[PDB]
Amino acid sequence: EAQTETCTVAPRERQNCGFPGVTPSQCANKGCCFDDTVRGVPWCFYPNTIDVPPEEESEF
Numbered sequence: 041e042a043q044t045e046t047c048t049v050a051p052r053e054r055q056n057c058g059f060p061g062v063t064p065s066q067c068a069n070k071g072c073c074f075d076d077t078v079r080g081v082p083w084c085f086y087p088n089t090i091d092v093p094p095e096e097e098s099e100f
Contacts, residue, residue: 047073
């Protein structure tokens with residue numbers, strides 16, 4: 041068994057990890073998923089590990 045890292049969460053269902061004026065380094069200081077693609081929403085937010093009973097295959 042194992043877990044998977046996932047930061048892609050619903051923009052509204054996102055947990056604010058800090059203000060937006062922050063920077064890639066600040067958000068990477070604690071370890072929050074930083075995402076600056078859309079506006080209006082927060083870029084620095086926390087991660088959300090989802091349980092995936094079935095393991096998938098990826099490139100190795």
